[PDB]
Amino acid sequence: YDIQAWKKQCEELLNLIFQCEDSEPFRQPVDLLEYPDYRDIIDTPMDFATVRETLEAGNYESPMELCKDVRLIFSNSKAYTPSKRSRIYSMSLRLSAFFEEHISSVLSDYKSALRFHKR
């Protein structure tokens, strides 16, 4: 029933993601000195520190907004990868599976709580 519970749930999920070794390439913005043409392919950079900071600033209204930004981290990795077998891309697929497995109940509980609020 709690319309605000998603925020702490997302904080705890981001804590789990930061503990995951697979998140290391995604914890901070992609370095343009390491990948000079990054912005020629990727229009909207995103990373987990920017997601956490947006959440902690009170700049997400719902877990769907957070989920859209986290998914952008993974679609950027898929768009920039030179191969479907690359190391960083392979790490993003596992991390995406972990994130989707955990965010599902957060989204369901929030949407259910909001429907109850507007009943």
Ligand X SMILES: Fc1ccccc1NCc1cc[nH]n1
Question: Which residues contact ligand X (rule: CB under 6 A)?
Answer: 25-26, 30, 35, 77, 80-81, 86, 88-89
Task: For the CB of residue 76, give the shortest distance to ligand X in the complex, in Å.
Answer: 7
Measured CA to CA, the distance from residue 92 to residue 33 in angstroms comes to: 21
Read off the amino acid at residue 57.
A
Measured CA to CA, the distance from residue 99 to residue 93 in angstroms comes to: 10
Task: For the CB of residue 25, give the shortest distance to ligand X in the complex, in Å.
Answer: 4
Task: For the CB of residue 71, give the shortest distance to ligand X in the complex, in Å.
Answer: 15
In the complex with ligand X, the residue whose CB is nearer, 6 or 89, is 89
- Reading the block at residue 12, the tokens are 């705890």
